[PDB]
Design a binder for this molecule. Structure first.
Ligand SMILES: Nc1ncnc2c1ncn2[C@@H]1O[C@H](COP(=O)(O)OP(=O)(O)O)[C@@H](O)[C@H]1O
Ligand SMILES: [Mg+2]
Lengths: 520, 104, 127
């Protein structure tokens, strides 16, 4: 969205051809305009026929029709039920608080309906005590109870809320924001079920994917934020089993970026299943598609059998006669390399990667997968299943193909992931705070002026919440240097606030500054 | 085939100066600005397409009545003074072709 | 003992002992043996410490206290001088481990944000 949005076009020209003489705001938004000896004082109300006012107000509902009130709706603290506040209170370790706010929202809506009062009377803070937002830790939250008919947030309250939110239009919320609020209710319902199993980097990932499902129109794969939430979770098995139902095809194992974070011991099984599916696609049986998954696993024999049973395919006779050889033989190794480089010139990139993997030249299979096929997701998967979980070919691939673009794009999620897969944990944790161009002589990769800068560098509060997690688990790497680390923690805390404040979550900014623990 | 071990920078090079080094199976090969090809072996292509664009000569009869396409094969039988060579040269002059190989 | 960006102050005093960080990092127990804080906010914090030099607080041992109570009016007016600087004043009070200023800043900023909601704006600003 633009940082500024027009809300009125005071068109004095519609009455006189004389140019505006002078313009001056005054008390309560009164905008006095002068021309000749003749003033055009406009009050702070709004004319809904204007295209600017109509577009800025959008679908919202506002108590007063004012430029002052409108400018206090498009900006300023969020109502505590706003979806952008609830997801940000979930990313911060305040899930219990979000559950309580949803319960209070239900109670307030029932109160309004029972008294037949208009919903616009709904309290923005839902009668919450502000100190609740400042509680340092999720398990220290005083989760009080309510009267018997609905004592604590649960499935019944969830369904009642999802009904009410369709039977009423919450104030200040564009209908799309209300849809995302309903999806947040569903996500909290899911988390409450899994809340007893997955640590809280599992809860953040679960909400990330549940929000992804509602935005497949504009979002083509879970952000690297969610991949990094899951990558550092201790319960990757639970997350994978929760999103498994959606991973039927490779195109859906590439949306959830499973190759990045799922455990190698599950990535092997997922390649087996994805090979099964990719073979028996909608069209017909074709061992060409599932070749890479079966070779990466080192199951050339299954691929050979697959080619054999594919009697109808035109390529069958050549491939059965070729693949059956033993590619430890130098002559056949060179023959397979030659065929791989021929297929790279006949524009058959996937087959070139397959052949480059027959001979165990992984460094050439993964470079054909990430550079000519454009699947870094599949390259990482093949690296992780074929050779091992972390490096050595994966390290070179990431440092060559991903690190430069990450530095140019100034992306710190990718940089942290890369320095994690290189098992450079001590600097992988630091890459979350300091920009990639300043890490490990990365300035040698690209000139500092080529990198993105200016307003495009919008912070990401979650990026800090991850650090405070890793920083606390990997203290061994931070005891050696405290003053230098604090010098940048105290900068990124004040730069993460001032976006938590610019995105309306002031209550979370105060919590972040209040509760941050400096490692003395 | 192979992995570019070295690629020359922009500048003026004679045909004999090395321009590229490429390693395949640990063996390094050197490539200049030219290469030799057996004239009796056809040069490979990824796939053979279907010729669908006209070979617009300058001749009304050949363009309208008996058109040829880019990538087609045509023959011009005739006696010893009916213009097989004048047609050939007019085509070499005014055809759409980006390059002409005139074989006598 | 003072911020490097042109920041200076009384090297030590009964006030500087108010900061529980300086209770150990201010050469406390010298017989047995600031960088982060911004200059202006450092001045503000020492002003608050000097003002309360003649007061006492229950510290973390307040149990039910240390919260759920109105803030001192002078502290209210003193901190309510800048919305953007109040967060970094809270962060400074956090780094120095000074509980009373932290509590006061959190109360003040919580009330600011609560009073910025549209309902409170209409109920207290124009009505
Ligand atoms: N399109 C033409 N316009 C004018 N004269 C032509 C044309 N085509 C052929 N001729 C004449 O015919 C002569 C003999 O034809 P030539 O081009 O040698 O073909 P061929 O090799 O079949 O004999 C040419 O030298 C020229 O004088
Ligand atoms: Mg002739």
């Amino acid at each position: 969205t633009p940082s500024y949005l027009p809300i009125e076009k005071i068109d004095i020209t519609a009455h006189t051809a004389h140019n505006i003489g002078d313009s001056v705001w005054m008390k309560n938004g009164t905008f006095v305009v002068a021309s000749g000896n003749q003033f055009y004082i406009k009050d702070k109300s709004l004319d809904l026929t204007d295209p600017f006012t109509y577009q800025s107000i959008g679908s919202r509902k506002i108590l007063s029709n004012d430029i002052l009130h409108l400018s206090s709706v498009l900006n300023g603290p969020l109502p505590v039920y706003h979806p952008q506040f609830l997801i940000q209170a979930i990313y911060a370790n305040k899930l219990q608080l979000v559950k309580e706010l949803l319960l209070r929202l239900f109670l307030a809506l029932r109160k309004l309906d029972f008294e037949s009062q208009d919903v616009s009377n709904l309290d923005s803070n839902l009668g919450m005590d502000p100190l609740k937002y400042f509680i340092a830790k999720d398990r220290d939250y005083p989760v009080e109870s309510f009267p018997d008919p609905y004592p604590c947030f649960n499935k019944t309250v969830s369904l009642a809320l999802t009904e009410q939110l369709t039977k009423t239009t919450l104030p200040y919320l564009t209908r799309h924001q209300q849809i995302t609020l309903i999806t947040v209710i569903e996500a909290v319902d899911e988390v409450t079920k899994n809340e007893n199993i997955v640590d809280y980097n599992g809860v953040r990932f679960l909400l990330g994917v549940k929000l992804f499902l509602s935005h497949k129109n504009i979002q083509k794969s879970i952000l690297m934020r969610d991949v990094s939430w899951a990558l550092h979770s201790d319960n990757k098995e639970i997350l994978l089993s929760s999103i498994d139902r959606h991973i039927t095809s490779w195109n859906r194992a590439r949306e959830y970026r499973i190759a990045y974070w799922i455990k190698e011991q599950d990535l092997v099984k997922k390649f087996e299943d994805i090979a099964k599916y990719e073979f028996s696609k909608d069209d017909k049986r074709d061992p060409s598609r599932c070749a890479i998954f079966y070779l990466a696993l080192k199951k050339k024999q299954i691929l050979l059998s697959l080619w054999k049973m594919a009697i109808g395919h035109p390529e069958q006779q050549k491939m059965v006669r070729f693949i059956s050889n033993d590619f430890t033989v130098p002559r056949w190794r060179t023959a397979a390399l030659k065929n791989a480089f021929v297929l790279l010139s006949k524009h058959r990139y996937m087959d070139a990667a397959v052949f480059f993997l027959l001979t165990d030249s992984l460094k050439d299979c993964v470079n054909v997968l990430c550079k000519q096929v454009h699947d870094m997701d599949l390259a990482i998967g093949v690296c992780r299943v074929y050779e091992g979980d972390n490096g050595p070919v994966l390290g070179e691939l990431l440092t060559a193909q991903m690190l430069p673009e990450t530095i140019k794009e100034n992306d710190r999620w990718k940089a942290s992931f890369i320095y994690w897969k290189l098992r450079k944990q001590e600097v992988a944790i630091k890459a979350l705070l300091t920009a990639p161009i300043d890490l490990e002589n990365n300035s040698s990769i690209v000139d500092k002026e080529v990198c993105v800068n200016r307003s495009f560098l919008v912070e990401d509060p979650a990026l800090l919440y991850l650090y405070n997690h890793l920083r606390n688990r990997n203290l061994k790497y931070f005891i050696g240097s405290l003053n230098v680390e604090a010098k940048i923690e105290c900068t990124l805390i004040l730069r993460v606030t001032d976006i938590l404040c610019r995105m309306g979550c002031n209550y979370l900014a105060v919590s972040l500054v209040k509760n941050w623990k400096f490692i003395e | 085939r192979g992995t570019i071990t070295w690629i020359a920078p922009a500048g003026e090079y004679t045909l004999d100066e090395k321009i590229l080094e490429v390693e395949f199976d640990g063996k390094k090969s050197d490539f200049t600005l030219y290469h030799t090809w057996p004239v009796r072996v056809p040069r490979p292509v990824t796939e053979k397409l279907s010729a669908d664009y006209p070979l617009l000569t300058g001749q009304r009869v050949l363009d309208a009545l008996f058109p040829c396409v880019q990538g087609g094969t045509t023959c011009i039988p005739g006696a010893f003074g009916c213009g097989k060579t004048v047609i050939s040269q007019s085509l070499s002059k005014y055809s759409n072709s980006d390059a002409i190989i005139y074989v006598g | 003992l003072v911020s490097g960006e042109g920041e200076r102050f009384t090297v030590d005093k009964k006030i500087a002992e108010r900061s529980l960080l300086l209770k150990n990092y201010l050469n406390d127990m010298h017989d047995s043996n600031v960088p982060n804080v911004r200059s202006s906010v450092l001045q503000k914090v020492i002003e608050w410490a000097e003002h309360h030099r003649d007061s006492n607080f229950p510290d973390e041992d307040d149990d039910d206290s240390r919260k759920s109570a109105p803030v001192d009016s002078w502290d209210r007016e003193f901190l309510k001088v800048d919305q953007e600087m109040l967060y970094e004043i809270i962060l400074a009070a956090n780094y120095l481990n000074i509980k009373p200023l932290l509590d006061a800043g959190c109360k003040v900023v919580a009330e600011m944000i609560r009073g910025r909601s549209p309902e409170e704006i209409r109920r207290t600003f124009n009505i």
